[PDB]
Write a protein that binds this ligand. Structure first.
Ligand SMILES: [Zn+2]
Ligand SMILES: [Zn+2]
Ligand SMILES: [Zn+2]
Ligand SMILES: [Zn+2]
Ligand SMILES: [Zn+2]
Ligand SMILES: [Zn+2]
Lengths: 302, 302
């Protein structure tokens, strides 16, 4: 049967969805408890948050992981396995919106200075936030790539850590020197570009998956030579590779043979060699006689 | 050759990209001229816009249409043809953000009433906006579906038309009865739900394309019977259909044959019958002997 070699690709996926669900679930509880500490800390202090969207970011990334367990349907024939890639794009988009709003809020503070703020509250608030974010980063943190959902709930955690550094640095200089208060808002600006830089290597490895591009991990040239290693085959055209999710790849190609007879042996030999370089989700390979091959058609050009 | 029947699918696409580029280009010029009318209308009136994002919405939908003309590459093997689907998702997202901001702005006006506004400016501004939006809607406005880019620059145009109706109704009731000014803000609320309803039948026909779902236009059952019409074939398993863009579909299936000999005739017969029901972008069909078929494997279940 042609489904014999798919066990390895099926076995690994089941372990990764359970392992990633457990790790993300534990971190959600810590965030929920940490938020509750603000309310019980005080009334006036708690009256004056950013942690509200943290609950949403840790709910979408976990709710979307449940739909990936759904079965097939006459629509969405492959399945719901791409819900994690598309469900981890909204989380990264949320980082851009929150930073943009916070930058706009900081801009208003620059033109209109304020003095009602007190440094005592800032120091105690920064210390509590720094500890919670640092521990939450550690628990989230041929070799398979990282999951496409734990890689989108980790950039947000490191995003809030930088703001914690910025507020501590800004508050520290105020105590040492009360003057030059105009340099307080610019601390956010100098520590906001870094948040918009760390989200550039994620929004590229995740945007070539949503437009049928070859994922990181497999090389086009390596696969092309592997098929040609078989003595029976002659040439390959219209090779197609695309990634259904981050660590699942699919293959589809044409093969031209020299001898029409005993073509079943060629099909079995090619499949075994292809599967010896990567665990493929599925593979579909045609056979075409050499006498019908034509080189003048445009579609066979790379 | 196996590329003989792809001419029909290639010919139609070239015409649609040129026809859609011409229509969208003309509408952009009208919007640019219409915006310039506000500045030359007056100084104090022009000092006190929403049309700024209209230029961006009519630039992304046209700039993204250029990348779809790019050639293939060792990465993104299929091509850049899905840039229009992904480039028409940001335009719809922009509608949600603008409405949300405008709703928030209207909320502040409700709690804090204002009287500095004059109805004379509102009436003349609404009349000019209503005419420009109405004409722009008309020019944009087996049978192929509409393009995936003209269907995302048309929802925005009809989105601004409803706001033009709302401001005219709100201004009209003020002149008839200066009292009950608290009913002015609710006019926007009663005419903002409609904008968030008209963008629900678009964000569904466009989200099952980005997750390898069957598009509107082709039925799974119809294709399955078409292959089985051939006397040579016995059964089909692991049938896969997905849409690369809105009006381009791809097929991939397995076929089990009874007689090993003369298998080349079966491959040619199946391809002709499949192409007689829909113009397919590409088709890949395997052949598997009956003696190797096994029914106990789980992967052959629908
Ligand atoms: Zn099979
Ligand atoms: Zn955050
Ligand atoms: Zn060819
Ligand atoms: Zn071929
Ligand atoms: Zn608009
Ligand atoms: Zn099977």
């Amino acid at each position: 049967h042609c489904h014999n070699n798919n066990k390895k690709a099926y076995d690994a996926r089941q372990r990764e969805q359970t392992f990633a669900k457990k790790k993300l679930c534990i971190a959600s509880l810590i965030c929920f408890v940490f938020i509750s500490a603000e309310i019980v800390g005080g009334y006036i202090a708690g009256s004056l948050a950013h942690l509200l969207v943290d609950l949403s970011s840790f709910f979408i990334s976990l709710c979307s992981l449940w739909l990936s367990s759904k079965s097939s349907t006459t629509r969405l024939t492959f399945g719901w396995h791409r819900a994690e890639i598309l469900g981890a794009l909204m989380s990264v988009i949320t980082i851009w919106l929150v930073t943009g709003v916070l930058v706009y809020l900081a801009c208003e503070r620059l033109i209109r200075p304020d003095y009602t703020i007190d440094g005592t509250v800032m120091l105690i608030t920064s210390a509590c936030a720094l500890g919670a974010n640092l521990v939450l980063a550690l628990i989230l943190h041929y070799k398979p790539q990282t999951n496409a959902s734990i890689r989108a709930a980790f950039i947000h955690v490191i995003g809030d850590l930088f703001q914690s550094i910025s507020v501590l640095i800004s508050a520290l200089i105020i105590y040492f020197k009360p003057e030059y208060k105009m340099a307080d808002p610019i601390c956010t600006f100098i520590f906001s570009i870094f948040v918009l830089i760390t989200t550039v290597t994620v929004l590229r490895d995740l945007l070539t998956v949503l437009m049928e591009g070859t994922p990181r991990g497999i090389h086009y040239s390596d696969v092309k030579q592997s098929i040609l290693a078989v003595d029976g085959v002659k040439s390959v055209h219209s090779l197609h590779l695309w990634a259904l999710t981050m660590n699942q790849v699919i293959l589809s190609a044409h093969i031209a043979t020299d001898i029409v007879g005993e073509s079943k042996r060629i099909l079995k030999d090619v499949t075994q060699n292809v599967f010896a370089r990567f665990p493929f989700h599925s593979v579909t390979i045609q056979v075409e006689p050499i006498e019908d091959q034509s080189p003048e058609c445009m579609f066979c050009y790379e």
